[PDB]
């Protein structure tokens, strides 16, 4: 077992959203160039970086025990999102408040 303190800081939830948004971005960002043919590298260090981290994960069958932080970490981010169903998603809520129609 870890420390056994059960930490939890909401102030970070903001950083989790950006990473979820940039990943969401980078996801479509790479699909936006294909529509406009050969396009330049959009001015966004986040996207470009994710595009790089994304290429990694695609070959990071290890996950969690890999050699990249943004790899394993990013794997849990997107993983949670989709796998998230019937819960109190604190990240998916603010990003896409959808549950109580």
């Amino acid at each position: 077992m870890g420390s056994g303190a059960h930490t939890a800081d909401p102030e970070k939830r903001k950083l989790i959203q950006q990473q979820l948004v940039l990943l969401l971005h980078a996801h479509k960002c790479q699909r936006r160039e294909q529509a406009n043919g050969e396009v330049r590298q959009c001015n966004l260090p986040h996207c470009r970086t994710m595009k790089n981290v994304l290429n990694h994960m695609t070959h990071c069958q290890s996950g969690k025990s890999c050699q990249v932080a943004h790899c394993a970490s990013s794997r849990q981010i997107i993983s949670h999102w989709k796998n998230c169903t019937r819960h109190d998603c604190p990240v998916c809520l603010p990003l896409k408040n959808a549950g109580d129609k």
């Binding site: 870890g2 930490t7 939890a8 970070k12 939830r13 950083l15 989790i16 990473q19 990943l23 969401l24 996801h27 699909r31 260090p45 986040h46 970086t49 994304l54 994960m57 695609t58 070959h59 990071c60 069958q61 996950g63 969690k64 050699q67 932080a69 943004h70 394993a72 970490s73 794997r75 849990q76 981010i77 997107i78 993983s79 949670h80 999102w81 989709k82 796998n83 998230c84 819960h87 998603c89 604190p90 990240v91 998916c92």
Partner: protein, 42 residues
Amino acid sequence: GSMDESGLPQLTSYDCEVNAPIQGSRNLLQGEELLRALDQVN
């Protein structure tokens, strides 16, 4: 010592699980499935 460098604010497997866990049992999307899955808006 493994002192990997990185500029992009990285997070620990815990910082993610705590803020947003998968609820046990690894998720379906990982590598190529992540792109095929991530593209499942609604």
